[PDB]
């Protein structure tokens, strides 16, 4: 049957090495017990072997008010932060936050898969009890389970192989000196991994960490890239037959609208998809600069505006609400980030992290439309209704016949003369 190799023999610490911190690892009833300390940094008991593709299993228990984790495909390099342990980590969190089984990129990218991405896994961890963990690291796929509950699922290629390590996190208050985290029955399967892998029917939804790519899961699910992360393929200027020769830069897997005078579509101009879409889920990652303005448009007719300014369509406003003057204009905030520009305001409380990339989601299912920001629904509307047409009649789009009522339209990225970054521009066409 399945060939399992023990990583810990229940007797001694053979096959392990302590890195960074000076916390103790004692053996109590066939379990590795990591003991908290004071004045020492994070400690890691790392395997003396590197593992690429594997199925890892271990039992774990932790004192409340303590944080722990198990490093996967992790490294310690003398050239990077004096051998500080970095890489994927299976979170052990007994706090009310409840992100156990989540993936944290230790001393590197930080949170990759927090349990906000899969909230039903928050109930998996049993406080002050033994918990059974399973990790499946197969190619670029890293998946985690706690007590049979799927927790995290990331698609990433940064480190294909590295060590497994047990974390004893540095403590801050005196009230946690002898507080322990314990690991037992640590075993690994490295032979016939594909024979014993968990099916796609019993996993957490995947998060693809490899910018501007379509994972096998995303492909099976009907996703395609609108931007390939390298070329202007699939895009043209709204009023041009080809891509603009200025005002748009592509570098480091980021599609950047250039900073100019902040004027509307006066630099390189807006860019549109070279094809039309009907029903879809459109996802766009964006990062703004101070006082920046841009937007994601859909139901676009690139031939309507032959004059100055932005091409005609419905818009997912992108803005620095704190600085850009347009945020205070319009009616009851209908020009702030995430709004249906000049029509429907985004709520006052929205999950926006101005220092990082944010994800815009636009869903079109015939007449039904939704705007999401970082997995939270902002607005909901229905075109081809008495309400829609009446609302459009009061707006900036009052002169456009049958505005936002057509089945098909192009998707657009706006030039509002400010520096805005884009990546992971993907589409899932719907029935």
Among Na ion, a copy of itself, none, partner that 380 touches (CB below 5 to 8 angstroms by kind): a copy of itself
Q: Which does 387 bind (CB under 5 to 8 A by kind): Na ion, a copy of itself, none?
A: a copy of itself
CB 74 within 8 A of CB 216: no
Q: Is 295 in the site for Na ion (CB under 5 A)?
A: yes
- Contact of residue 161 among Na ion, a copy of itself, none (CB under 5-8 Å per partner type): none
33: left (phi over 0), alpha (psi -120 to 50) or beta: beta
Judged by beta carbon distances under 5 to 8 A according to partner kind, the member of a copy of itself, Na ion, none in contact with residue 394 is: a copy of itself
Q: Give residues 303-332 in contact with Na ion (rule: CB under 5 A).
A: 317
Rule CB under 5 A: say whether 404 interacts with Na ion. Answer: no
Judge contact between 349 and 361, C-beta under 8 A.
no
Judged by CB under 5 A, which of 32, 33, 45, 69 binds Na ion?
Answer: 69
Nearer to a copy of itself, 95 or 385 (CB): 385
Closest CB 403 distance from a copy of itself, rounded Å: 12
Cβ of residue 93: shortest distance to Na ion, in angstroms? 7
Which tokens sit at 266? 């006066």
Q: Considering CB distances under 5 to 8 angstroms, the limit depending on partner class, which of a copy of itself, Na ion, none binds residue 20? A: none
Q: Which residues, in sequence order, are CB contacts of 349 under 8 Å at separation 6+? A: none
Residue 50, Cβ neighbours under 10 Å: how many? 15
68 beta partners: 92, 168
Sequence-distant (6+) residues with CB within 8 A of 328 are none
- Mapped onto helix, strand or coil, the DSSP state of residue 50 is coil
Asked if 269 is part of the footprint of Na ion (rule: CB under 5 A), the reply reads no
Min. distance of Cβ 397 from a copy of itself in angstroms? 12
424 binds, among a copy of itself, Na ion, none (CB under 5 to 8 A by kind): none
As a whole number of angstroms, the distance between CA 178 and CA 184 comes to 19
SS3 203: coil
Tell me the Cα Rg of the chain: 25
Partner whose binding site includes residue 331, from a copy of itself, Na ion, none (CB under 5 to 8 Å by kind): a copy of itself
**Could you tell me the smallest distance in angstroms from the CB atom of residue 296 to a copy of itself?**
18
Cβ density class 341-354: b for 16+ within 10 Å, e for less: bbbbbbeeebebee
Nearer to a copy of itself, 242 or 387 (CB): 387
Binding site for a copy of itself (CB under 8 A): 331-332, 334, 343-345, 379-382, 385-391, 393-395, 398
In terms of CB distance, is 189 or 255 closer to Na ion?
255
Map tokens 């009023």 to a residue: 239
**202: phi then psi, degrees, rounded to nearest 5:** -125, 40
Q: Which is nearer to Na ion, 93 or 156 (CB)?
A: 93
If the CB atoms of residues 297 and 371 are measured against a copy of itself, the closer one turns out to be 371
Asked whether 161 and 122 are in contact (CB, 8 A), the reply is no
């Amino acid at each position: 049957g399945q060939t399992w190799e023990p990583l810990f023999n229940g007797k001694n610490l053979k096959g392990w090495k302590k890195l960074n911190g000076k916390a103790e690892y004692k053996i109590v009833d066939g379990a590795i017990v990591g003991i908290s300390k004071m004045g020492t940094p994070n400690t890691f008991l790392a395997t003396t072997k590197n593992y690429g593709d594997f199925i890892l299993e271990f039992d774990f228990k932790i004192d409340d008010g303590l944080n722990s984790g198990v490093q996967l495909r992790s490294e310690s390099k003398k050239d990077y932060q004096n051998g500080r342990v970095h890489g994927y980590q299976f979170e052990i969190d007994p706090s009310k936050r409840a992100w156990s089984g989540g993936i944290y990129d230790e001393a590197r990218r930080n949170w990759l898969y927090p349990l906000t991405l899969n909230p039903a896994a928050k109930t998996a961890f049993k406080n002050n009890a033994w918990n059974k963990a399973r990790i499946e690291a197969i190619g670029n796929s890293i998946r985690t389970w706690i007590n049979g509950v799927p927790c995290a699922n990331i698609w990433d290629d940064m480190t294909p192989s590295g060590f497994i390590a047990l974390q004893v996190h540095a403590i801050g208050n005196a009230s946690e000196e002898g507080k322990t985290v314990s690991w037992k029955d640590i075993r690994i399967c490295t032979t016939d991994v594909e024979r014993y892998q968990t099916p796609e029917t019993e996993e957490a939804p995947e998060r693809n960490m490899i910018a501007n790519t379509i994972s096998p899961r995303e492909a099976k699910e009907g996703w395609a890239l609108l931007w390939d992360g390298k070329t202007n393929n699939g895009w043209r200027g709204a009023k041009l037959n080809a891509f603009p020769e200025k005002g748009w830069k592509m570098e480091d897997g980021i599609l950047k609208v250039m900073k100019s005078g902040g004027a509307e579509s006066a630099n390189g101009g807006d860019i549109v998809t070279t094809r039309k879409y009907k029903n879809f889920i459109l996802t766009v990652d964006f990062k703004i600069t101070e006082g920046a303005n841009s937007g994601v448009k859909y139901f676009v007719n690139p031939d309507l505006n032959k004059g100055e300014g932005s091409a005609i369509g419905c818009e997912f406003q992108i803005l620095d609400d704190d600085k850009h003057p347009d945020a205070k204009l319009g009616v009851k905030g209908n020009r702030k980030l995430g709004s249906l520009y000049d029509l429907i305001p985004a709520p006052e409380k929205k999950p926006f992290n101005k220092k990082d990339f944010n994800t815009a989601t636009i869903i079109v299912q015939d007449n039904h439309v939704e705007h999401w920001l970082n997995g939270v629904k902002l607005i909901e509307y229905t075109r081809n209704t008495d309400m829609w047409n009446a609302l459009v009649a009061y707006s900036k789009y009052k002169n456009w016949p049958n505005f936002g009522n057509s089945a098909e339209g192009n998707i657009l990225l706006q030039d509002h003369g400010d520096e805005v970054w884009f990546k992971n521009v993907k589409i899932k066409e719907l029935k």
